[PDB]
Amino acid sequence: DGDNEVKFTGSSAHEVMTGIIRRFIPYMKYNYTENTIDNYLDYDDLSSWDEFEKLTEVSAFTNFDGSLKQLMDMVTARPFNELFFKNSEKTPGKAQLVLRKTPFNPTEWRALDMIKVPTEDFIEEDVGKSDVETYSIFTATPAGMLKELNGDVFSKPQFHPELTDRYGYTKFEVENIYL
């Protein structure tokens, strides 16, 4: 206090992201004859992995003179949560900020609305397999302060025995600010 430090605390992304957006959104004023960005952006119906994520102390100034988008990325903790701007189908006429857990989960995959399109609307196509992305070992390290030589369990990876034969010891690491 006295200094411009601000601390945001929450046990989930939707709790933190609410505090982050709500901190700065109203005061971002403009000359609209009718309101500001809070009326035109719902930024509601957010969710994430509340059960697996502990309490967070994400700092305002984690990025030196960066944009809110740079600070928004840290809160997102990609790729475990998907953030993008898209039209609000439930409320036509206005936009919506989406922050939800990734749809690669089985039940969350089924929760996405399906859309049909036959070949009769296809002008051109360019689709195929690729081995550009290929990893064998996957791990989710906790926030980078905790380090193996000065504390508790550092990491806990996972691999398939058949997979590593073709691609040996190919690691894939992601830091998660939450844990």
Binding site: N31, T33, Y40, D73, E82, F85, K86, N87
Partner: protein, 87 residues
Amino acid sequence: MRRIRRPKVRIEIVTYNGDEFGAKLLGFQTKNSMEDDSSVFQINMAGDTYWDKLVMANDIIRIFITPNDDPNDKEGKQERLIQVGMV
């Protein structure tokens, strides 16, 4: 039978009337992509009026596209918004 399509674009603007702005439409592009961290769109306007003196920066433009014919009572008659953003 072959389908028939009659597109009818509308544009609405909030700070010059929006209906007059939409009339001079010629073409637009709307690049939206989750791969990158930024969604961007472009609009081409006719040279009938001096838009440089009119359209002040940071205005909000809404675009509506009519997929197919109104009276036919097709499912496409929804006036679904395609994109909204800040110039």
